[PDB]
Design an enzyme around this catalytic site. Structure first.
Site, PDB file in Angstrom:
ATOM      1  N   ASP A 285     -11.099 -28.022 -51.361  1.00 35.49           N
ATOM      2  CA  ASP A 285     -10.148 -27.995 -50.260  1.00 35.49           C
ATOM      3  C   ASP A 285      -8.933 -27.216 -50.765  1.00 35.49           C
ATOM      4  O   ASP A 285      -8.901 -26.812 -51.925  1.00 35.49           O
ATOM      5  CB  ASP A 285      -9.735 -29.405 -49.848  1.00 35.49           C
ATOM      6  CG  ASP A 285      -9.177 -29.448 -48.436  1.00 35.49           C
ATOM      7  OD1 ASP A 285      -8.487 -28.479 -48.049  1.00 35.49           O
ATOM      8  OD2 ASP A 285      -9.423 -30.442 -47.716  1.00 35.49           O
ATOM      9  N   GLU A 491      -3.001 -33.745 -40.251  1.00 37.21           N
ATOM     10  CA  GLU A 491      -3.043 -34.352 -41.578  1.00 37.21           C
ATOM     11  C   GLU A 491      -1.983 -35.431 -41.827  1.00 37.21           C
ATOM     12  O   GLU A 491      -1.737 -36.275 -40.963  1.00 37.21           O
ATOM     13  CB  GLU A 491      -2.969 -33.250 -42.647  1.00 37.21           C
ATOM     14  CG  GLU A 491      -4.194 -32.336 -42.599  1.00 37.21           C
ATOM     15  CD  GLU A 491      -4.138 -31.171 -43.580  1.00 37.21           C
ATOM     16  OE1 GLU A 491      -4.114 -31.407 -44.809  1.00 37.21           O
ATOM     17  OE2 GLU A 491      -4.126 -30.012 -43.108  1.00 37.21           O
TER      18      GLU A 491
HETATM   19  O1  LIG Z   1      -7.192 -24.426 -43.971  1.00 31.16           O
HETATM   20  C1  LIG Z   1      -8.144 -24.695 -45.050  1.00 31.16           C
HETATM   21  C2  LIG Z   1      -8.338 -26.230 -45.247  1.00 31.16           C
HETATM   22  O2  LIG Z   1      -6.990 -26.744 -45.291  1.00 31.16           O
HETATM   23  C3  LIG Z   1      -6.713 -28.133 -45.748  1.00 31.16           C
HETATM   24  S1  LIG Z   1      -5.032 -28.604 -45.290  1.00 31.16           S
HETATM   25  C4  LIG Z   1      -4.025 -27.160 -45.758  1.00 31.16           C
HETATM   26  C5  LIG Z   1      -3.615 -26.086 -44.472  1.00 31.16           C
HETATM   27  O3  LIG Z   1      -4.665 -25.133 -43.998  1.00 31.16           O
HETATM   28  C6  LIG Z   1      -2.410 -25.068 -44.833  1.00 31.16           C
HETATM   29  O4  LIG Z   1      -2.073 -24.327 -43.634  1.00 31.16           O
HETATM   30  C7  LIG Z   1      -1.137 -25.856 -45.422  1.00 31.16           C
HETATM   31  O5  LIG Z   1      -0.076 -24.947 -45.916  1.00 31.16           O
HETATM   32  O6  LIG Z   1      -1.598 -26.723 -46.555  1.00 31.16           O
HETATM   33  C8  LIG Z   1      -2.611 -27.790 -46.295  1.00 31.16           C
HETATM   34  C9  LIG Z   1      -2.654 -28.617 -47.656  1.00 31.16           C
HETATM   35  O7  LIG Z   1      -3.086 -29.983 -47.478  1.00 31.16           O
HETATM   36  C10 LIG Z   1      -7.619 -29.209 -44.876  1.00 31.16           C
HETATM   37  O8  LIG Z   1      -7.682 -30.432 -45.545  1.00 31.16           O
HETATM   38  C11 LIG Z   1      -9.098 -28.669 -44.593  1.00 31.16           C
HETATM   39  O9  LIG Z   1      -9.689 -29.503 -43.602  1.00 31.16           O
HETATM   40  C12 LIG Z   1      -9.102 -27.091 -44.125  1.00 31.16           C
HETATM   41  O10 LIG Z   1     -10.389 -26.662 -43.865  1.00 31.16           O
END
Ligand SMILES: OC[C@H]1O[C@@H](S[C@H]2[C@H](O)[C@@H](O)[C@H](O)O[C@@H]2CO)[C@H](O)[C@@H](O)[C@@H]1O
Ligand SMILES: *[C@@H]1O[C@H](CO)[C@@H](O[C@@H]2O[C@H](CO)[C@@H](O[C@@H]3O[C@H](CO[C@H]4O[C@H](CO)[C@@H](O)[C@H](O)[C@@H]4O[C@@H]4O[C@H](CO)[C@@H](O)[C@H](O)[C@H]4NC(C)=O)[C@@H](O)[C@H](O)[C@@H]3O)[C@H](O)[C@H]2NC(C)=O)[C@H](O[C@@H]2O[C@@H](C)[C@@H](O)[C@@H](O)[C@@H]2O)[C@H]1NC(C)=O
Ligand SMILES: *[C@@H]1O[C@H](CO)[C@@H](O)[C@H](O)[C@H]1NC(C)=O
Length: 603
Positions: A285, A491
């Site tokens: 992730d 989230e």
């Molecule tokens: O987007 C890829 C993946 O992301 C994580 S959360 C990620 C956000 O995409 C990003 O825009 C922000 O700056 O940071 C967070 C860090 O937690 C997510 O768990 C997953 O489901 C998704 O495919």
């Protein structure tokens, strides 16, 4: 001489073997690296032999960018990758979790919790087919979906990304996979990765494993349960994904009984790869390995060593690629990580690329651009929104006349509430921006616009966001529709311990319903404290997060179709009963899973 791997007529495993054998350590590690588009450059992709790119939430070429602008951006990057010595094309991933949601003008389908209320797996398969076409419309070939988490506590900020608290419903909803990737052949072997062609995309089951079972629903925290419970609640859906050829699997930030999933070799290699026979590639992730330690990123050298040995194949760095590559190279040269592990990872990544036809079709199809937000897809979203609505109450007392369906012809009616004319609130998180947004952020129909499009031309429609009690009593309205609910969130920002809707919300419902019979439409990503709302209204509908096609709500309110949705989760009486799921001993809900009143067509 003859180069086997470039021969499109040779079997996949042969092309993989022939290519792997020609690669240097730098090129192999390059394939295991995925970086954000924000830090990408033709030179970076070329010099570092990068294997994949992605757009995190909100990472777009421009605000309002057209489908062709997206295609040009993706092709620009692909051009660089194809100019390397071996010419290995990159794979571009994005979070298309309820339509190609990062893109302006893309059809926005209802979030998963609502889809679970439909109990219609075929419908979800069709949404998958439409989603793939819209993702390909922008030149992208990989979607980070579906999230097959089993949310066991609504206080979790990502519970809306979960189809249900009952793993049986989540399993039947895996039909999204064959919709996104295409149906697997009859000769199919469970565990093999599969993608039909250029109008399909590689899918991703996430997050492995037990992400929806953390303590008190704290995002990314610890899932405390025994192996048997882990295996009959959180694991089942993954086996289904295997039978449908899911191409990749993403690892969760969460831990199981104290062990970080990003460093758990027992489950990742031992179970997923050796027992379930998964043959696609495993991806981490966002900064998943950094968070293996505490504080996060405090011992990156150990993060790389632990995650790669645990069994991960591709690493979503996603920014500091120089450090990742340097540290990983050091470990290999030092013998800390064997070459066989590296070869295994690259084999899996190449297997997926060769299988989906990437080497034969590395660039975008300009003709696919017209697929973005086409009417047929919007009609599908409309059908989905309507079937996801759950009618919880229709008449204050059992002797009262049913308020729904409402008549399309009346002298004057009132539409009120913070959510009655706000497309952003209607879509929730993961829409345009990462956390979602307020107002008219994309193309769609609000509840207010839906009502005006449905009523008889002689019906006078008055809108007031937050009217006071006497405005309502003296207005002379036949009835009113009031929409309120949660604000967009994604989230951790979603973690909520009180679970009560923001104000003004309850006060608007009380002011309006106190003056005239009212139908309350609740917009939310999960069950919330509802008693007060329930006491004040004649009818209450749970619409979850319907998406861009607001007419799905009015189709059921005015009787064009009847209510058929049923609760996909348990509706609690109070938050201190949590966690409380079907099966427990202290199971005493306000509404039980499966609950839902119905009606028949015609107003
Ligand atoms: O987007 C890829 C993946 O992301 C994580 S959360 C990620 C956000 O995409 C990003 O825009 C922000 O700056 O940071 C967070 C860090 O937690 C997510 O768990 C997953 O489901 C998704 O495919
Ligand atoms: C039950 O728990 C929840 C979660 O813990 C809690 O809500 C959170 O409260 C935080 C306060 O510590 C708040 O942080 C502040 O947010 C401010 C800005 O917030 C607006 O913008 C964000 C997006 O950036 C939205 O998510 C918010 O909903 C909010 O949006 C605006 O809200 C107003 C008022 O309702 C509305 O009129 C506007 O139209 C609307 N506009 C938008 C952009 O949509 C920052 O300025 C500040 O620095 C803090 O960071 C969290 O945002 C919030 N979480 C969410 C997503 O709601 C909740 O708290 C209650 O509600 C909040 C809004 C406030 O009124 C509190 O006094 C109230 O207690 C809590 N409820 C209970 C029962 O205690
Ligand atoms: C879980 O969340 C709590 C809340 O502060 C934190 O102290 C703890 O370190 C977290 N542990 C895990 C499993 O991430």
């Amino acid at each position: 001489d003859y180069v086997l791997y470039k021969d499109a007529t040779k079997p996949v495993e042969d092309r993989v073997a022939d290519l792997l054998g020609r690669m240097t350590l730098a090129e192999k590690i390059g394939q295991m690296t995925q970086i954000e588009r924000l830090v990408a450059t033709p030179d970076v992709l070329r010099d570092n032999f990068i294997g994949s790119l992605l757009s995190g939430g909100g990472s777009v070429p421009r605000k309002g960018a057209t489908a062709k602008e997206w295609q040009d951006m993706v092709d620009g990057f692909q051009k660089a990758c194809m100019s390397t010595r071996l010419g290995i094309p990159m794979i571009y991933g994005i979070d298309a979790v309820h339509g190609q949601n990062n893109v302006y003008g893309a059809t926005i389908f209802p979030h998963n919790v609502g889809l679970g209320a439909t109990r219609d797996p075929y419908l979800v398969k069709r949404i998958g087919e439409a989603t793939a076409l819209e993702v390909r419309a922008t030149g992208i070939q990989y979607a980070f979906a579906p999230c097959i988490a089993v949310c066991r506590d609504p206080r979790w900020g990502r519970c809306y990304e979960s189809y249900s608290e009952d793993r049986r419903i989540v399993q039947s909803m895996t039909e999204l996979i064959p919709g996104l990737q295409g149906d697997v052949p009859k000769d199919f072997t469970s565990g093999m990765p599969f993608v039909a062609g250029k109008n399909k995309v590689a899918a991703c089951a996430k997050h492995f494993v037990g992400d929806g079972g953390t303590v008190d629903g704290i995002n990314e925290n610890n899932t405390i349960i025994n192996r048997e419970g882990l295996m009959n609640i959180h694991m089942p859906a993954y086996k289904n994904a295997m039978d449908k050829g899911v191409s990749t699997v993403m690892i969760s930030y969460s831990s199981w009984n104290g062990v970080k999933m990003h460093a758990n070799q027992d489950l990742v290699t031992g179970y997923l790869k050796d027992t379930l026979k998964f043959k696609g590639f495993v991806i981490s992730d966002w900064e998943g390995i950094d968070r293996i330690t505490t504080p996060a990123g405090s011992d990156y050298s150990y993060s790389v060593k632990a995650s790669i040995l645990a069994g991960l194949d591709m690493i979503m760095v996603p920014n500091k690629y120089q450090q990742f590559i340097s540290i990983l190279t050091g470990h290999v040269n030092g013998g800390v990580i064997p070459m066989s592990r590296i070869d295994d990872a690259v084999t899996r990544i190449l297997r997926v690329k060769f299988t989906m036809g990437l080497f034969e079709n590395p660039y975008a199809d300009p003709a696919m651009a017209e697929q973005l937000g086409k009417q047929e897809h919007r009609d599908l979203a409309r059908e989905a929104a309507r079937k996801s609505l759950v009618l919880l109450k229709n008449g204050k007392t059992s002797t009262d006349a049913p308020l729904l369906p409402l008549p399309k012809k009346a002298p004057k009616i009132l539409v009120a509430g913070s959510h009655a004319d706000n497309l952003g609130y209607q879509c929730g998180g993961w829409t345009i921006e990462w956390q979602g947004d307020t107002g008219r952020t994309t193309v769609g129909t609000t509840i207010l616009e839906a009502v005006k499009a449905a009523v008889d031309p002689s019906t006078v429609v008055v809108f007031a966001e937050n009217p006071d009690a006497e405005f309502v009593k003296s207005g002379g309205f036949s009835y009113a529709i009031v929409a309120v609910g949660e604000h967009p969130y994604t989230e951790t920002k979603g973690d909520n311990l009180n679970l009560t809707i923001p104000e003004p919300g309850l006060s608007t419902v009380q002011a309006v319903c106190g003056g005239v019979r009212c139908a309350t439409v609740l917009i939310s990503g999960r069950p919330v404290v509802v008693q007060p709302l329930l006491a004040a209204s004649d009818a209450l509908v749970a619409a979850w997060l319907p998406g861009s096609e607001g007419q799905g709500v009015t189709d059921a309110l005015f009787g064009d179709f009847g209510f058929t949705g049923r609760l996909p989760r348990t509706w609690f009486k109070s938050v201190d009963q949590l966690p409380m799921n079907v099966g427990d001993a202290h199971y005493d809900p306000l509404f039980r899973l499966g609950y839902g009143l119905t009606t028949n067509a015609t107003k």
